[PDB]
């Protein structure tokens, strides 16, 4: 049967809409099935993706501040494969975005400050409901252009708020940052964003 999707990405387009993306191993398929429903009681929505080349879909008319569960499966001639599951919420009422994604097991929204033309500080809130007690966080930094190597910072500790200063950066260059909690068992969901320092 088809393998489970190896990755499930969420990106908020607005306070009531997001793009769901997934990734299937390079190794047919007929398509995908994307299921979602409110976590506090609601009908099951099932989206059928009849093209295996399509690995993303937009979902609109979502309720703000309501937790949803998303399930993505792949289909082939043999049958359906196991699903990758994800819980997420679009929260909405500090400069920045008025709406933010949140899942209980991921770090809080990323707050960036450009301390200088070649350095910044990043802070994030502790996960609301982590899967296992936290040992620390892994923070990775890399050029969004590609090719260049990534830098991985280990942030030991389980503070309610964690902070990291990143030196050696270049102005006008986009950098992709990833933050994920390290727990006793393994890692949690990672929050990712691209920034650029300018004056």
């Amino acid at each position: 049967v088809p393998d489970t999707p190896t990755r499930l990405v969420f990106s908020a387009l607005g306070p009531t809409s997001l793009r769901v993306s997934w990734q299937e191993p390079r190794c047919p398929l007929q398509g995908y099935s994307v299921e979602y429903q409110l976590l506090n009681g609601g009908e099951l929505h099932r989206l059928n993706i009849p093209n295996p080349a399509q690995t993303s879909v937009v979902v609109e008319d979502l309720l703000p501040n309501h937790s949803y569960v998303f399930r993505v499966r792949a289909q082939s001639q043999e049958g359906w494969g196991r699903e990758r599951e994800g819980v997420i919420t679009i929260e909405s009422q500090l400069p920045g975005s008025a709406f933010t994604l949140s899942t209980p097991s991921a770090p809080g929204p990323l707050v960036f400050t450009a301390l200088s033309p070649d350095s910044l500080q990043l802070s994030w809130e502790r996960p609301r409901r982590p899967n296992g007690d936290i040992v620390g966080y892994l923070v990775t930094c890399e050029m969004a252009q590609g090719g260049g190597p990534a830098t991985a910072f280990r942030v030991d500790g389980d503070s309610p708020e964690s902070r990291l200063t990143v030196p050696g950066l270049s102005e006008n260059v986009p950098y992709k940052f990833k933050v994920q909690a390290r727990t006793t068992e393994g890692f949690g969901p990672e929050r990712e964003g691209i920034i650029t320092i300018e004056s």
Binding site: L94, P95, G96, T100, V111, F112, P189, I194, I195, S199
Partner: peptide, 23 residues
């Protein structure tokens, strides 16, 4: 590819960030 501009001396900015499950 959404990029968030960080301006020096403008203070902290809360960026909109993607969440990823798995790898």
């Amino acid at each position: 590819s959404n990029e968030n501009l960080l301006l020096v001396h403008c203070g902290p900015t809360l960026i909109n960030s993607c969440i990823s499950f798995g790898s």
